[PDB]
């Protein structure tokens, strides 16, 4: 759209305070997910591999888990090779702020804090790569 991404503050799995507006200057691949979401099992390892490249190119991932316990979320991260920030939307406030319907949904947010594209359903590693390029600082 080019619309303003709603700001939010959540904690990551180790207690790190992450506020979306502090990531201006970086692309944010904002991925709403749950451990029961089948596509996330294949998308997570693609995202981890791509992050190896993109983290130093100024694209951040914030993988917003929707409402699940730390133990289940940590277990999923171990299972699927997660090396990127995962935050806990424990009471669905951020999911609701983004008006998210199906999971997974990814918002591609550019370095200015604007939503440039919203994607739902399945995506391959090539698509993820291309998506991250859309939001990297120029």
Swiss-Prot record:
Involved pathway(s): Protein modification; cytochrome c assembly
The opening ranks of the lineage are: Bacteria, Bacillati, Bacillota, Bacilli, Bacillales
Note the residue range shown relative to the complete protein. 38 to 175 of 179
Output the GO biological process annotations, alphabetical, semicolon-separated: cytochrome complex assembly
Going by the UniProt record, its keywords in alphabetical order are: Cell membrane, Cytochrome c-type biogenesis, Disulfide bond, Membrane, Oxidoreductase, Redox-active center, Signal-anchor, Transmembrane, Transmembrane helix
- Keyword Iron found: no
Q: Where in the cell is it found?
A: Cell membrane
Q: Which superkingdom, per the lineage?
A: Bacteria
Recorded protein name is: Thiol-disulfide oxidoreductase ResA
- Record has Disulfide bond as a keyword: yes
């Amino acid at each position: 759209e080019g619309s303003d991404a709603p700001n939010f503050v959540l904690e990551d799995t180790n207690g790190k305070r992450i506020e979306l507006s502090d990531l201006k200057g970086k692309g944010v691949f904002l991925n709403f997910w749950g451990t029961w979401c089948e596509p996330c099992k294949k998308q997570f390892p693609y995202m981890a591999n791509q992050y190896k490249h993109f983290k130093s190119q100024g694209v951040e991932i914030v993988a917003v888990n929707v409402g699940e316990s730390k133990i289940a979320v940590h277990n999923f991260m171990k299972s699927y090779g997660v090396n990127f920030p995962v935050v806990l939307d424990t009471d669905r406030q951020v999911l609701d702020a983004y008006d998210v319907s199906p999971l997974p949904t990814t918002f591609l947010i550019n370095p200015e804090g604007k939503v440039v594209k919203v994607v739902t359903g399945t995506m391959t590693e090539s698509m993820i790569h291309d998506y991250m390029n859309l939001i990297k600082p120029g």
